[PDB]
Structure formats: C-alpha cells, structure tokens
C-alpha cells in the first residue's frame, strides 16, 4: 500500500461539518465513507443526508447517541438521500425518506475491519474512508489545534469519526466539529505505537459500505 | 440530593465558606460542547472567592453520542454572594446558535 493516502486529494471527501451539539457523530462518520465510495466508484462527489440517518435508524437514539454500522446497514438496506434533499436540522424529528422520492444512492453491504489490528486498518483505508472510533471527550482532545496526537485520552470509545488518510506515523482523521478544530476539521492522530488499541483506542470498531 | 443541577438555574443557594457544593449538567462532550466559564476554562474566574473541581461522568452505555454529566464541585472561600456563570459552548468558538447558560448564586456569610 502507498506510503501516504490522503482521499481529499483524489476528490472523495467533501468540506468539514459541524454537527452542532446533537449527538449525531455516529451519522456523520458514517456518511463520509459513502460519499467516500460513491466518489471511489461513479467519479461523482455529492453529499449525502446525516439527518435521514438520525431521523430513520430505528435502532440509533438520535442525537442521544447510535453506531456507524447501524447507519451503514440502513444505507445497505434502504439506500440515502442527498444533502440537499434531506438537510441537517440537528435535531430528530420523523423520518422523512418516504416523501423525498427515490434514495440517491444505496450501497451493497458493511463490512468490519479486523478489529486492534494497525495494518489491518491502513490496508482498508488505501481502499477507501474507514469508518472509526475513538476516546474524544478529553480536554485536550477538545482543544486540539494540530500537530500529531500522541494523548493524552483513554481507550474506553465515545466519539465517531472517519479516517480519509494515513502516513508513516499517523492516521489522519476527518472530524465533524467544523473548521475551526484541530487541522482545518481534521485531526492526525499518532500511530505505529504497538498498541493495539491504537491511540485514544482508534482501532476498536471500524467499518467501511461495501459498494460495487 | 443537594446537587444543583439545570432545574436550579438562576437559583441562590445559601452555604458557608469552604462548603463543596454539588453541581451536575448534562454534558456531551464528544459533540465539542462542554460546560465553561468565560474564556472557555473549566477553572474560577476568581480563585479569591470560589474554587473548583471538575469531573466528567459518561454514561456506561456503547452509544456513540449517548451524553452524560459534568460535575463541577464548588468550595466558596469568602463571605458575600458569587455567581458561578457557566456557558455550554465550543471553547474554541465561544458561544453559538446550540450554546446554554447556566448561572448558580452562592451566598456566603
Ligand atoms: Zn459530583
């Protein structure tokens, strides 16, 4: 695999949200992977509907919390609409797929990554944006401004978010905290440490849409 | 308990100097909001008349975004009345369209 990745620079990630305060990073996360794959396979980048995903996962709380896979099996199973279509509210409110006419795009399945394993994650990330997880409520997490990010944080997960690249000592990690965090959005977070867990846990839970 | 939590909001709670007192808002940090005093620090505006300490508790649930609670545990060290004035916001940012105010008056004789 190459020595450095960076999706944004083949036109596959689209600009840095901003979730606001509802607790919807785990539709977040998952909606960079598919406008990921959708890009990877038709050339096209749109943006797709975080708010159909808070809205519509039956098994997700809303902004009370849910899981990237459960959002990447609702597109796999019922597809998703555009950005557009079905803008964030960041609120729930019902779920309106049903009066936006046909889903915009649907993938073909999830798949999990063998999980507390580096390699094993940068090998899908070469592929595509990886859905991931990680220790983020700490301060200095919070108050991120750059660099690569070696701790502190703990290994017990509470945030999602996607990885569109890598390079020899880090994964570098798409945000959802708008513009003004971290590197314009983004965050390098160190690897290569042995840790298993990866840093802040990185490598505990990681999914990627499966798309033909 | 005699937690102060957001149902106190604006409250005046009578206490003596060097009493801790309890208070617990709920908080979802993974969102980037948390609860600050001005400035965006956890920390006394005036460690003159007030000190604080600051404990995040999650809830123990796997829900990403699932929120849980702040605790600030205050101790008064002067006499008079002290307003603890909290702003749920992006520290980064400062306050925005999403961002609450919670206030707590201390009154020490
Ligand atoms: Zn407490």
Redesign the pocket.
């Known amino acids: 695999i190459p020595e450095y990745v960076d999706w944004r620079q083949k036109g596959a990630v689209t600009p840095v949200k901003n979730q606001g305060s509802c607790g919807s990073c785990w539709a977040f996360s998952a909606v960079v992977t598919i406008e990921g794959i959708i890009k990877i396979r038709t050339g096209n980048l749109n943006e797709y509907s975080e708010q159909e995903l808070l809205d519509c996962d039956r098994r997700s709380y809303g902004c009370n919390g849910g899981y990237p896979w459960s959002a990447l099996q609702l597109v796999a199973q019922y597809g998703i609409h555009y950005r557009n279509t079905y803008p964030y509210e960041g609120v729930q409110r019902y779920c309106r797929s049903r009066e936006k006419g046909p889903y915009a795009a649907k993938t073909d399945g999830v798949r999990q990554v063998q999980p507390y394993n580096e390699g094993a994650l940068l090998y899908s990330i070469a592929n595509q944006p990886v859905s991931v997880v990680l220790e983020a409520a700490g301060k200095d997490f919070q108050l991120y401004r750059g660099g690569i990010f070696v701790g502190p944080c703990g290994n017990k997960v509470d945030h999602a978010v996607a990885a569109v690249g890598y390079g020899p000592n880090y994964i570098l990690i798409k945000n959802s905290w708008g513009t003004g965090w971290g590197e314009n959005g983004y965050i390098r977070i160190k690897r290569g440490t042995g840790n298993s867990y990866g840093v802040c846990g990185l490598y505990t839970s990681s999914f990627y849409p499966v798309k033909n | 308990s005699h937690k102060v939590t957001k149902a106190h909001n604006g409250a005046t709670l009578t206490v003596a100097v060097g009493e801790l007192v ?1 208070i ?1 808002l709920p908080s979802n940090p993974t969102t980037g909001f948390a609860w600050y005093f001005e400035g965006g620090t956890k920390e006394s505006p005036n460690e003159s008349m007030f000190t604080v300490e600051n ?1 995040y508790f999650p809830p123990d649930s796997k829900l990403l975004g699932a929120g849980g609670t702040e ?1 600030f ?1 205050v101790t008064v060290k002067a006499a008079g009345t002290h307003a603890v004035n909290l702003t749920y916001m992006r520290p980064w940012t400062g306050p925005s369209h999403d961002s609450e105010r919670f206030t707590v008056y201390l009154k020490a004789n």
């Open positions: 309890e617990q404990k605790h545990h």
